[PDB]
Ligand binder design. Structure first.
Ligand SMILES: C[As](C)(=O)[O-]
Ligand SMILES: C[As](C)(=O)[O-]
Ligand SMILES: C[As](C)(=O)[O-]
Ligand SMILES: C[As](C)(=O)[O-]
Ligand SMILES: C[As](C)(=O)[O-]
Ligand SMILES: C[As](C)(=O)[O-]
Ligand SMILES: C[As](C)(=O)[O-]
Ligand SMILES: C[As](C)(=O)[O-]
Ligand SMILES: [Mn+2]
Ligand SMILES: [Mn+2]
Ligand SMILES: [Mn+2]
Ligand SMILES: [Mn+2]
Ligand SMILES: [Zn+2]
Ligand SMILES: [Zn+2]
Ligand SMILES: [Zn+2]
Ligand SMILES: [Zn+2]
Ligand SMILES: [Zn+2]
Ligand SMILES: [Zn+2]
Ligand SMILES: [Zn+2]
Ligand SMILES: [Zn+2]
Ligand SMILES: [Zn+2]
Ligand SMILES: [Zn+2]
Ligand SMILES: [Zn+2]
Ligand SMILES: [Zn+2]
Lengths: 272, 267, 274, 274, 267, 272
């Protein structure tokens, strides 16, 4: 017979689920690498091969604003939210200023429930392959638990009164909170965007108020804003941090687990 | 169907086209006359890239947006046409405008050739044949260029321009060089760089000065007004012109720049 | 217009890598002169003459050139640096030098980048006048290294994970295989005096079947006789030679380090394909 | 700081002679790459690639490089001069090319001087900027040519006039022997396609006895098999190889043109001695 | 009895001696402190030459009387110790004072070595051993020389002397050079050459100036009197000194000249 | 038995006689290449190996001033003058201003009598070998007759009103007269010498009076004088002409016959 078709909204999710599924399900990701996901716009093609899938996973917390309408044209397909159970961090200011922060995957302690929700989602869809999925989930959690200790151990070194993480959509609030870092971001969440210069302004000062050596951006949004801060208090522009999407198998962050390790050192060795 | 090759800009496009013959369909990411050092790829470009059977590029950080643009384009053969060429440094990063030098172009086409036979080896015979013929025209014109620029006497071989894109040209035919900014970049330039160029024309008596087709002329004109230095029009480096217009081909771009400068220091 | 400095390297691969950071600013030369066994080479006295007249001598380290220590000892003050510094070795599995570091590191473009940087620092101190060039060349070489790394991983990803087996004569490709997730099978760990043995070609004859590996390779500096053996008795296709410890002539493939990585992976990829 | 010009020569002997007038001012390179038959060489396409990229191409002429005419015809404007101009040839005795000029002229230091001068004129026009160097190098090379000429005539004058017999495989030494009054005996006039013949080795077997010649020589680019023949049947000692159409490696004798004349005469002199 | 080697002058004599060890008896034609470019061989010399088992010389027309002197000396092995070395030109004939450059001396001793084993091959082992050891000392001192002359800051590395015998030294350690006459010759010099040197000291502020032991100081002193430039004594190139006296060995000659110049531009 | 020992005063003679003697007599020359011969001073060695020779040839015309006294201490040896029969050219001025010019060998027409006198000298000394000596003399004359035509044919080209030969001891008067050349010399014959500057003066003017391009000197005397003239009317200093002695087998003029050919072209292609 044939293998079931699973479909995740974006790549970070796609890779997370690929570790739980092993060779048993064919897992594809809706969006296509380094694409803004917070507000992607689906094409008939994505809605037509979606209708031809056995299940659609998604993050929730309104990460994908475009999804409710997309799922809207798939009747033909159930869909599980991978955040089921996590206590969210509310946002800071602006528009959806008290709605959940969707970037909960950035906390390994939260990545654990994420795989749990993936597992439960499969165990049912393809019960015949319960064992595996379970074997694969155990292993993967074991790995998330591992990488989790390596991060606490990476960020501890930089002194507490220098633990400042500065970015664009500061979608790391979670990683922030896990290892006790203070957060400095130009905007709270992605959107129509185009950042005001009052924002890029607060950044110009908070980094002088706080003498932060390295600032970074991300592979989905624009570097134009931060670079300024790369031009205000000699701050060093680190490369890109990774959250709303991985990089290909070449280049860094080709797997979620790598995103985590990676983001961490360049932070760690950007504050040192 | 023929394979698709995509290159970062339009000088590369005319070059790799000449090697490709009617056996490949060759496409440039940037339009015509667009500043290439500082372009912001549209998702239109990203898709073009994905379906591309190969992507050629300059390297030497010429096209600064490429690490990023290639970031979001999985598997997709990627070669730098600059490999094997020695840079003149600029703070002291490499001057990417290597193609501006006939002797160097021979190795661009060389790397284009290597990459076309690794790609469509079924047509290997053609590429080499084209490349050999192209290479030969390259030689023919490298001379003539020398034969144009030597007329202008050794001590008035000053090449003033907006970006220092001509280092490899200057180098090749013993020309001193003067420019308002070394490399395109955040730019807007400064009043103090204009204050440096507007000095040479008198400190070395340069009748003629130029800019280039991808960057603003506003600044190089000041210098022209602040000094009895005629502002000759555009030079061409980062991009071509349209068939109508000068410089529709790389070779044309070469013969052209040299002729306008050569005369333009005469009288 | 004092002449240019003189830089000496152990083998031809290192010679092309440094010649690529130096440009026409230094004059790079090799001890071993093409396809020659670099691990147990025996320096003629011209070799020793050169060395004492060079202004700097650049070597791999990690005990690659086993003859260096001694060769070095007989030249008066002349500097020497190991391009290998900062690279974390893969240690050897068995044979003499059991847990000695695997020198074949340059075969890893990630690693090649640290090679090229140390060449850079060595040259700025050697000839600080021309620093600007070394950075500019190193920049450009570093950058072309990253291109092919990306391009290399993109070539070996084709062959499916359960067929990703790299059979060579020397385990000279252990870094390359770590980088692109291959399983290595070698006829002998590293080079050591005691010619490979028939339990060794034997072990290789079993790992192959055991994995139904379609193509098996040697390298251009060692004995094809043992690998050929496991070929006319296993059924595998003998791909030709891979290149690790030395490049090729102007003719033939691999006349440059970059060509070496490109070549090596291409003929591997299509080797285990069908 | 435009790079330096590029000069190409047919064979390695010419390469060392020109490299000696150019200095570090031009970059001299050879087509044929050591001990290789220079008379009927078959240019690979890299050879042809080089040629079209060189800024000047210097060749012997006198039909030495039989392949040149054709090789030349397929490169676009690039200059070519014959270093041989002004030298009065010795014509060939027999075989095809009967009365064709003997090209082996450089073997005569008197003649070498006209070689070196024409290299000089070619370079001043090529690169008039650096003229001063070419004269200064040519001066010094011309001068060291006169030393060894004097020194060469002083070496062959030892052996007595009625034993002054020079047996080689190719009559490549006819000028050398005219200069120092030797009688030449060759297995074949010049190189020609139709491998030497057994009436030829035969004629040589008779001229030797006929003159009780103690040592007989070959050259490093041709077949020792015929000369060795006339040796194990005549009783003469087989001196090794003389060097005409090509030099040697950094190792072995004759790594330079001057060393070539020195060597050639020394091993001849002591060859017919006792 | 040991073989006799004869060399044109006394710097060559100390060099070939060092290679020869106690296995050869080495003799110089010219005495000590004698102008070598312009000596007139006595028939005493001619006979010495005849019984010489070998004659070594500089070449590059250094010793202009040699074509003639060797004219009347039948069979007598003759080598130039200059073969393989590239000249700095001077009208534009080669500057013969090549030995003045450690990196060059290595090839003088090299040619001495080659010629000693072609001559007494029975003792070949010794020569090479000496030459290798001599060569090593050459290296040791080439450094130190650089390490002395770099102290004097890049823009006061001016070496003023009577003959331009130091070109290969100047070259080797980036020194500009000033001299009253390029090469010894008919000479007597001119008042106009003194008029050129007496200009540098002010046009480049040179505290110290020198002459050499084989040629007249009368002229270089004028310059010293016409300018606040202290006249440091003699430099040494064409010849040595006596054991008593500085510069009794080649190596000494090297270390010496460099030290006096280096300090002598200090203050 | 043994071969007879013949001894010539100087090298030009030595080589002349060596062609007539072939391998049959051992011929040595008293003086030793590029040596002033007009007034050499003999050493006991030269007088002792001379006493041990079977015959001593000499030029005559007082060329060798030192000879009468030398022959003085050889009793033990006869001696033939090789000039017997030649009509000499008297000198010009100075000391022996009307005594014969000894340099008669410079005329091939005179070199013929010279070999004749050598032949006659041998035919007797070693009659047993008459034939040879005669065969050798024929051949040699044949060669002198040859080279004689080549010279007339070499010097004709330069125009008559440019045929000026300038040297030191102008010992070429003979070569001068054979092919109609005018002669310009600093001194008429060698001697204590040390030339006055009144002489080197006449040369400075006669060359301007006569616009002579190249002047030369010789391998036995000093170049110091002429060089001046090499510094007075842009005159080109040619190398050395050869008369009172050859150069070794290396270098030019290793044989008399070569001296002649040689001297001629450099003259010829020094006036053109
Ligand atoms: C020690 As573990 C990673 O297997 O639990
Ligand atoms: C990980 As901790 C508690 O050591 O800071
Ligand atoms: C080191 As430096 C610049 O003195 O040559
Ligand atoms: C890297 As390549 C482009 O020479 O094969
Ligand atoms: C010929 As030129 C000196 O112009 O380079
Ligand atoms: C000429 As040689 C002195 O190298 O043999
Ligand atoms: C013609 As003839 C020289 O033999 O007399
Ligand atoms: C030799 As004639 C007479 O031709 O002048
Ligand atoms: Mn540009
Ligand atoms: Mn190895
Ligand atoms: Mn030949
Ligand atoms: Mn001197
Ligand atoms: Zn649930
Ligand atoms: Zn990939
Ligand atoms: Zn360069
Ligand atoms: Zn050893
Ligand atoms: Zn050095
Ligand atoms: Zn050790
Ligand atoms: Zn040089
Ligand atoms: Zn052919
Ligand atoms: Zn060129
Ligand atoms: Zn023809
Ligand atoms: Zn008589
Ligand atoms: Zn001789």
């Amino acid at each position: 017979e044939e293998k079931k078709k699973v479909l995740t909204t974006f790549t970070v999710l796609a890779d997370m689920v690929q570790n739980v599924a092993g060779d048993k399900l064919v897992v594809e990701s809706i969006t296509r690498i380094g694409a803004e996901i917070h507000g992607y716009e689906p094409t008939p093609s994505d809605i037509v091969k979606a209708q031809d899938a056995d299940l659609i996973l998604y993050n929730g917390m309104n990460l994908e604003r475009w999804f409710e309408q997309f799922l809207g044209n798939v009747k033909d397909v159930p869909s599980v939210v991978l955040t089921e159970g996590i206590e969210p961090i509310p946002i800071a200011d602006g528009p959806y200023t008290d709605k959940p922060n969707p970037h909960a995957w950035m906390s390994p302690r939260n990545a654990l429930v994420y795989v749990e929700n993936i597992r439960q989602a499969f165990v049912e869809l393809d019960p015949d392959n319960a064992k595996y999925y379970n074997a694969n989930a155990a292993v993967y959690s074991e790995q998330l638990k591992a990488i989790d200790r390596q991060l606490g151990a990476d960020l501890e070194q930089v002194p507490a009164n220098q633990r400042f993480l500065v970015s664009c959509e500061g979608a790391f609030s979670y990683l922030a909170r896990d290892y006790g870092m203070e957060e400095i971001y130009m905007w709270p969440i992605n959107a129509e965007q185009q950042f005001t210069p009052k924002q890029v302004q607060t950044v110009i000062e908070e980094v002088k108020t706080n003498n932060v050596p390295t600032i970074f951006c991300e592979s989905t949004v624009s570097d134009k804003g931060q670079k300024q801060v790369a031009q205000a208090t000699g701050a060093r522009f680190g490369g890109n941090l990774y959250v709303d999407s991985l990089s290909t198998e070449e280049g860094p962050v080709p797997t979620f687990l790598d995103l985590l390790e990676y983001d961490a050192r360049v932070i760690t060795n950007g504050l040192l």
